[PDB]
Amino acid sequence: KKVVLGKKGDTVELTCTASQKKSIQFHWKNSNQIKILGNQGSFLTKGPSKLNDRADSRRSLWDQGNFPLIIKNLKIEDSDTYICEVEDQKEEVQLLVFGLTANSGQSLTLTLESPPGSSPSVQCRSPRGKNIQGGKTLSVSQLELQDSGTWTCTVLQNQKKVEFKIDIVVLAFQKASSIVYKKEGEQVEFSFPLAFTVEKLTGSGELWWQAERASSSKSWITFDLKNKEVSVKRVTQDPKLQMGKKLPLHLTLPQALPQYAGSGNLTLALEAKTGKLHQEVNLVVMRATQLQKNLTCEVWGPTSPKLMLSLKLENKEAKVSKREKAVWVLNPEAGMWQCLLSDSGQVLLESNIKVLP
């Protein structure tokens, strides 16, 4: 009858019950007709299977009449059909066990461990919401620093599902790119997690930033790291940057503004191994608001030309859309409008405005 799923390494339980809620003779058998365990009164006698050591049952639950089967430290090789044996009728429970592991920069591979004959589908969404669908093996080719939180993989068989969580960290000074999209006034955060080996090397670094204007070829702070202690050498007057003292490199902008925009370079050198470390960083800033009649949404920073800006209420259609960096509506309609800076597939920056007149 019943079907039970399980997470690799978890503990699950196949509950069997009969009519008489007391101590009476019962046992468990697998597909191969091997005794799983036996009982002499209250005490438990061990079954001949190789899972005898790992698998177990609750002696305490004999009062209610329930005859549970417990499998601590579930392995892939446990998926099977099990039979509860009271002489009047046998209840069978079919069991499939899955497991999730991550093999192998800018790309990672995920391998899903599956039992035989299974026909499963595997969704996995990022912390930022990126929805990735796949089969037995999933490959994440292109990663950016923003997509470095906790990823959630939901595995589905025919109708029944099991949920797995796995953390993903993207190394800063590898080829992976860093980009941050903020509307004006939101504080900006940059994190540059380094590989565990380089934490004890010690070194010094700085960040240079360039805005829209060619005047600011270089700027921004300079800092020294020894042991797991981050100490700044010099800080720019215009941004009130806050860098975290603790070892994970944490850098904060109090709030995002258009002048604080443009590509930047972060360079870390270290006397230990003497290898020049570079890092690319971008910040894109949106301002969307209506002054008097006019309604305006514009974006500042280094944006690919391909992407598109639109002003639209999701109820109606886009009142104006152009491939330019600035979009403006004249004598605009009443409603809950939106400004969307967007790629082909997905939206990069969404702002929700509401006009009153």
């Binding site: 191969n32 002499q40 009164g41 209250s42 005490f43 044996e85």
Partner: protein, 360 residues
């Protein structure tokens, strides 16, 4: 089929300090001096034996004897609280006086009450849960001793003409196989004095038993002759020791005056078998050991008794039965493993109350 109570009837003494004589005097009647066995005609009755409710009564009439005989010093027993699931399950200990009392079984007879009758098969094989034809009615069963033991059924009745095996269902390796012998295999267990050495570093806990090898091989030679009749197909009878568990199951366990002998039975089941022997070629030294912290057979929970007697502990027993399990499976490559089992005392009395049934 009735579900009544049966009054016991044993030949007591009412004068000695023997425990069973004290219990039998307060709740048992004297034995019937003139029994009558009316032989029925051409009748057939489906004598099921594993669903017999009469054995469920004897087991509850013996537990009431052990609570009047061997009072434990510390009776640690579990006790849970009705809380769904951290279930509150705290132990509840009881401290009682522990006087070393005498201990010896006495044959009792379960008799039918007023208005009911007890049937009895008389076939020399009987097969267990199969219908026989020589059904005769009686009013009281034969001599039944309340001996509590594991892996080897002690003192009791022997088979009629041939060693028969009984099991609720074969080939399912869960039900124990009761083997009844047709010849009394003796056993003597002693420790005279000579070992007053209490500890070793900061022996009285040692005893031994002997089995007549020249006599025991005959009875074992007939058991394999019957087991191969059930599996005569490239498979092989291979005995072995226990597969582990509690110390009252891994080894033999019987009692003699509060001495809870835990006899290691590995030099008795180690031999592999075929139509020929693999033992040797008189006095098989069955190493035993008196214990003090036991696991009760009358429910879950440990116990702790008083230290053993100074000396001269003798057990001139018999061996009438044998409890054997079976190890089957898909890895069974033409073999037959019969490890010693037992522990369920209901199975100890089903080997004795198989001939009867209470009918109205």
């Amino acid at each position: 089929d009735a579900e009544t109570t049966l009054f016991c009837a044993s030949d007591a003494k009412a004068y000695e300090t023997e425990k069973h004589n004290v219990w039998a005097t307060h709740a048992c009647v004297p034995t019937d001096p003139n029994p009558q066995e009316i032989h029925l005609e051409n009748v057939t009755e489906e004598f099921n034996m594993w669903k017999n409710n009469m054995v469920e009564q004897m087991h509850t009439d013996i537990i009431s004897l052990w609570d009047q005989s061997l009072k434990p010093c510390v009776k640690l027993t579990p006790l849970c609280v009705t809380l769904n699931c951290l279930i509150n399950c705290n132990t509840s200990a009881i401290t009682q006086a522990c006087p070393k009392v005498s201990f010896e079984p006495i044959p009792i007879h379960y008799c039918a009450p007023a208005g009911f009758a007890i049937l009895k098969c008389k076939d020399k094989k009987f097969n267990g849960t199969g219908p026989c034809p020589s059904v005769s009615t009686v009013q009281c069963t034969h001599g039944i001793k309340p001996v509590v033991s594991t892996q080897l059924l002690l003192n009791g009745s022997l088979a009629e003409e041939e060693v028969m095996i009984r099991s609720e269902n074969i080939t399912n390796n869960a039900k124990n196989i009761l083997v009844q012998f047709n010849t009394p295999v003796q056993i003597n267990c002693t420790r005279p004095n000579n070992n007053t050495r209490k500890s070793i570093r900061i022996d009285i806990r040692q005893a031994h038993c002997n089995v007549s090898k020249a006599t025991w091989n005959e009875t074992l030679g007939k058991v394999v002759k019957q087991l191969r009749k059930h599996f005569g197909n490239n498979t092989i009878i291979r005995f072995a020791n226990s597969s582990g568990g509690d110390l009252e199951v891994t080894t033999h366990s019987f009692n003699c005056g509060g001495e809870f002998f835990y006899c290691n039975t590995s030099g008795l089941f180690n031999s592999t078998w075929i139509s020929n022997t693999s033992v040797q070629g008189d006095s098989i030294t069955l190493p035993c050991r008196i214990k003090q912290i036991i696991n009760m057979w009358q429910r879950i929970g440990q116990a702790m008794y008083a230290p053993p007697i100074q000396g001269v502990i003798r057990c001139v027993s018999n061996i009438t039965g044998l409890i054997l399990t079976r190890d089957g499976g898909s890895t069974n490559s033409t073999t037959e493993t019969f490890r010693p089992g037992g522990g369920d005392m209901r199975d100890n009395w089903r080997s004795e109350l198989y001939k009867y049934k209470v009918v109205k």
